Design a protein around this ligand. Structure first.
Ligand SMILES: Nc1nc2c(ncn2[C@H]2CC[C@@H](COP(=O)(O)OP(=O)(O)OP(=O)(O)O)O2)c(=O)[nH]1
Ligand SMILES: CN(C(=S)Cn1[nH]c2cccc-2c1C(F)(F)F)c1ccccc1
Ligand SMILES: [Mg+2]
Length: 637
DNA sequence: CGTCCAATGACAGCC
DNA sequence: GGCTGTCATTG
C-alpha cells in the first residue's frame, strides 16, 4: 500500500536517501505546510510570508511507486547529528543542477516562491506542473484540483484521498494549511499522486504533440510569472491619493451640477431615482425595447439633455475610485529591501485562448488616461519603479493583425502593415472623413474596436450601433471589408470549415481549443462558436508569441547579468541591477529596469520580441521608457 | 431569443 | 439579507 519514509530520522537512512536522490533525473516534491493552531503544539519550521500563522514543517519526495520520502524541515530530528543546517545544505544540493533534471510540483509558482522566501532555496531544475498539462489538453476545462487530476488520470489511487476534503480545493494538498490533517501525511500523499499522474499526463501530451510546448513555452512561462509575483510592481501612495482627490473633487462638481439640472438631489447609485428624473420629470424619450438607465440608453440621450452625459461621467469616475483606488491601496505592501511600497498580483494562466491575466488585484484593468475638465486622470502614474530606475514598456504594434495577415496570406493587409501608416487612424480617417494626423486617441480607440469587431464577426446591427449609422449602411462597410481583403475572408471561411470537421482549432504552436458548439442547432450558439474559432487562432497565437518572447528575454537577462533573478531573491539573502518582469499586458511587456541598464535591456527586449517567431510579416516592436506606467515616452534604440 | 473575442470583480438589485 | 451577474474596466 502506502509507505512514508522519514529520511531525517536516521543518518544511514538519510545518506541512502541523498545518494539515491542525486541519481534520479525525475522526481516530485510537495511542501508540507501546517498552521500554528496553538503555541503548545511545539511545532518548528519556516514561517511563510503573508501567512505568518503557517509554517513549512517538511517536504515529501517521490520518484516512483507508492513510496514517499518525507524530508523533515523541523529543528528537532530523531538523529540530532543531522542538524537543520546540514539538511538545508543537502536539500539545496539536490534541488539545483550542476545535468538535466525534472521536478514535478503541483502549484509550481507558489512552491517556488515559498521555497525561496521561507526556506532560502532557489530551485534550479526543469519544472513540470500537472495543472498546466491539464490546461494544455483542454483550455476550457475547470481549473484542476488534486481530486480532479486523480479522478481522470490516475483513478486507481482514488481511495488515497478519502478523509482529506481539501483535495478538491484547487490549492495543493500540502500547501493548504487550513486542513486539520498533518502536513507530513498531506505532502506524502500528494507527491505520490502528482508523480504518477504526471506520467500519464506526459503520455497524453506526447500523443497530442504538445510535449515541446509544455517544456519550452508553458512551464518556462510559469517561471517567468513566478519571478513577476516575487518582484511585484511599485506603487506610489502619494500619486494615488493625489488623483483620488482630483476625482472626488470632480464628483462633487458633477453631483452639484446634476442636482441643479434635476431640481432636486438624487442617488447616482439608484437607477429608479435616475429613471424618475430623466423619464418622469425631464420627459426624455424612453428606449424602444423600458425605463433603463444603461450606457446604451444614456448615450442616445446625451444630445437631448446634459444630465445623461453627467451621469455617464459620474459612473466612470466612481468606478476608478471604488474598484481601482480602494483595492490598490488595500493590497499595497511595504518592501523594506527596496525602500518603497509595492503590489503583488497573482498570475492566472488557465485561460480559454492562452492569455495571461492577474488577480488580487487585476493590474491589467487599471484605467487609461481620461480627460477631466477642471487635465487628464492617469491612474498609471501611481505605478513607479524603485528609486534610481525606469519602467520599460515594449509592445507589439498590431500583433493580432500581423498574425492574421500571416495566416490569411492577404497581400493587401501585409502591404498596409509593412507601411508605417497606422491602420486604426486610417480607418478613422475614412470613417469621419478627416486627415489621419488629426485622429485623437478616443477616435483611434473607437476605430480599433471597429476593426477587431468586424474581423471577428460583428454583425451589421452592432456595427451600426458602434458607428452611429443605420444598420443598412453598416452592412456596406462589411461588404467593402470582405471585398477589400479577400484573403482575410477566405481565411475566415476555411477556419469555420476546418473547425466543423475537426471539432477544434489550433494556435500557431499546436494548442487545441475544442469548440463542440460549431455544429449546434441553435443559430446563436453555432455562430458564437464560429467567431470563437477565428479569434482563438489569432488571439491564441498572439499569446503563444508573447510567452516565447518573455521566456527568451528572461534567458537573455540571466546571461547578460549575474545579478539577482527577482526582488525576492535579494530578500532571501549592492545596488539594484538589471531588468525585472513586473507586468504582462497581453501584447505588451513591462520591466522595472535600473537606469544604468535601461539601454541594454531595451535592446535585449526588443530583439527577442522581434525574433521570437519568423512570420511572413515583420513583428514591429516599440519600446517606451518613463518614470512611471503613465509617463512612458518613446525610446528608439 | 441572446450574433466581435478574451479577462477580473465590487456593488446594485435580486428572486 | 446574504447571494449572484451585471455592467463597469482592460487588452
Ligand atoms: N476582439 C477584440 N480584440 C481586441 C479588442 N481590443 C483589443 N483587442 C486585442 C487585439 C490586439 C490586442 C492588443 O490591443 P491593443 O489595445 O494593444 O491595440 P493594438 O491593436 O495592439 O494597437 P496599439 O497597441 O497600437 O493600440 O488586444 C476588441 O475590442 N475586440
Ligand atoms: C470598409 N472599411 C475597411 S475595409 C477598413 N479596414 N481596414 C483593415 C485592415 C485589416 C482590417 C481592416 C478594416 C475593417 F475595419 F473593416 F475591419 C471601414 C469600416 C468601418 C469604418 C471605416 C472603414
Ligand atoms: Mg498594442
Amino acid at each position: 500500500s502506502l509507505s512514508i519514509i522519514d529520511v531525517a530520522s536516521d543518518q544511514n537512512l538519510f545518506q541512502t536517501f541523498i545518494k539515491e536522490w542525486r541519481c534520479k533525473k525525475r522526481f516530485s516534491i510537495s511542501l508540507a505546510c501546517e498552521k500554528i493552531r496553538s503555541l503548545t503544539s511545539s511545532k518548528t519550521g519556516f514561517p511563510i510570508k503573508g501567512c505568518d500563522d503557517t509554517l513549512v514543517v517538511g517536504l515529501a519526495v517521490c520518484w516512483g511507486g507508492r513510496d514517499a520520502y518525507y524530508f523533515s524541515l523541523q529543528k528537532e530530528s530523531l538523529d540530532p547529528s543531522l542538524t537543520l543546517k546540514d539538511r538545508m545544505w543537502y536539500l539545496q544540493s539536490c534541488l539545483r543542477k550542476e545535468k538535466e533534471c525534472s521536478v514535478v510540483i503541483y502549484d509550481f509558482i507558489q512552491s517556488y516562491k515559498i521555497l525561496l522566501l521561507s526556506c532560502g532555496i532557489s530551485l534550479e531544475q526543469s519544472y513540470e506542473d500537472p495543472k498546466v498539462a491539464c490546461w494544455l489538453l483542454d483550455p476550457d476545462s475547470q481549473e484542476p484540483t488534486l481530486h480532479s487530476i486523480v479522478t481522470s488520470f490516475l483513478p486507481h489511487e482514488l481511495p488515497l484521498l478519502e478523509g482529506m476534503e481539501t483535495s478538491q480545493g484547487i490549492q495543493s494538498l500540502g500547501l493548504n494549511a487550513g486542513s486539520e490533517h498533518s502536513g507530513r501525511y498531506r505532502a506524502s500523499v500528494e507527491s505520490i499522486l502528482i508523480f504518477n499522474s504526471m506520467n500519464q499526463l506526459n503520455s497524453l501530451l506526447q500523443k497530442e504533440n504538445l510535449q515541446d510546448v509544455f517544456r519550452k513555452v508553458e512551464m518556462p512561462s510559469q517561471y517567468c510569472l513566478a519571478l513577476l509575483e516575487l518582484n511585484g510592481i511599485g506603487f506610489s501612495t502619494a500619486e494615488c491619493e493625489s488623483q483620488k482627490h482630483i476625482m472626488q473633487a470632480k464628483l462633487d462638481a458633477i453631483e452639484t451640477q446634476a442636482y441643479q439640472l434635476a431640481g432636486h438631489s438624487f442617488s447616482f447609485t439608484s437607477s429608479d431615482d435616475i429613471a424618475e428624473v430623466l423619464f418622469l420629470e425631464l420627459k426624455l424619450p424612453p428606449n424602444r425595447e423600458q425605463f433603463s438607465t444603461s450606457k446604451d440608453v444614456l448615450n442616445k440621450l446625451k444630445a437631448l439633455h446634459p444630465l445623461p452625459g453627467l451621469i455617464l461621467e459620474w459612473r466612470r469616475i466612481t468606478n476608478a475610485i471604488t474598484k481601482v483606488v480602494f483595492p490598490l491601496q488595500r493590497e499595497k505592501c511595504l518592501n523594506p529591501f527596496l525602500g518603497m511600497e509595492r503590489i503583488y498580483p497573482v498570475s492566472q494562466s488557465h485561460t480559454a485562448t492562452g492569455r495571461i491575466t492577474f488577480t488580487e488585484p487585476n493590474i491589467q484593468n487599471v484605467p487609461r488616461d481620461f480627460e477631466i475638465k477642471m487635465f487628464s486622470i492617469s491612474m498609471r502614474h501611481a505605478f513607479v519603479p524603485f528609486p534610481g530606475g525606469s519602467i520599460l514598456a515594449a509592445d507589439y504594434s498590431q500583433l493580432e493583425l500581423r498574425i492574421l495577415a500571416h495566416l490569411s496570406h492577404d497581400r493587401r493587409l501585409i502591404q498596409v502593415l509593412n507601411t508605417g501608416a497606422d491602420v486604426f487612424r486610417s480607418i478613422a480617417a475614412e470613417w469621419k472623413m478627416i486627415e489621419p494626423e488629426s485622429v485623437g486617441d478616443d477616435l483611434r480607440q473607437q476605430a480599433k474596436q471597429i476593426c477587431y469587431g468586424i474581423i471577428y464577426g460583428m454583425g451589421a446591427k452592432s456595427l451600426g450601433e458602434q458607428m452611429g449609422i443605420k444598420e443598412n449602411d453598416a452592412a456596406c462597410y462589411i461588404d467593402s471589408f470582405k471585398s477589400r481583403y479577400t484573403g482575410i475572408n477566405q481565411f475566415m471561411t476555411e477556419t469555420v470549415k476546418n473547425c466543423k470537421r475537426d471539432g477544434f482549432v489550433q494556435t500557431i504552436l499546436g494548442r487545441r481549443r475544442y469548440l463542440p458548439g460549431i455544429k449546434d442547432n441553435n443559430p446563436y450558439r453555432k455562430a458564437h462558436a464560429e467567431r470563437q474559432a477565428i479569434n482563438t487562432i489569432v488571439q491564441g497565437s498572439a499569446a503563444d508569441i508573447v510567452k516565447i518572447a518573455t521566456v527568451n528575454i528572461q534567458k537573455q537577462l540571466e546571461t547578460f547579468h549575474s545579478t539577482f533573478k527577482s526582488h525576492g531573491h535579494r530578500e532571501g539573502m549592492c545596488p539594484i541591477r538589471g531588468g525585472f518582469f513586473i507586468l504582462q499586458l497581453h501584447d505588451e511587456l513591462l520591466y522595472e529596469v535600473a537606469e544604468e541598464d535601461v539601454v541594454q535591456v531595451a535592446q535585449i527586449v526588443k530583439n527577442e520580441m522581434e525574433s521570437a517567431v519568423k512570420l511572413s510579416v515583420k513583428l514591429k516592436v516599440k519600446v517606451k521608457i518613463g518614470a512611471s506606467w503613465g509617463e512612458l515616452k518613446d525610446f528608439d534604440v
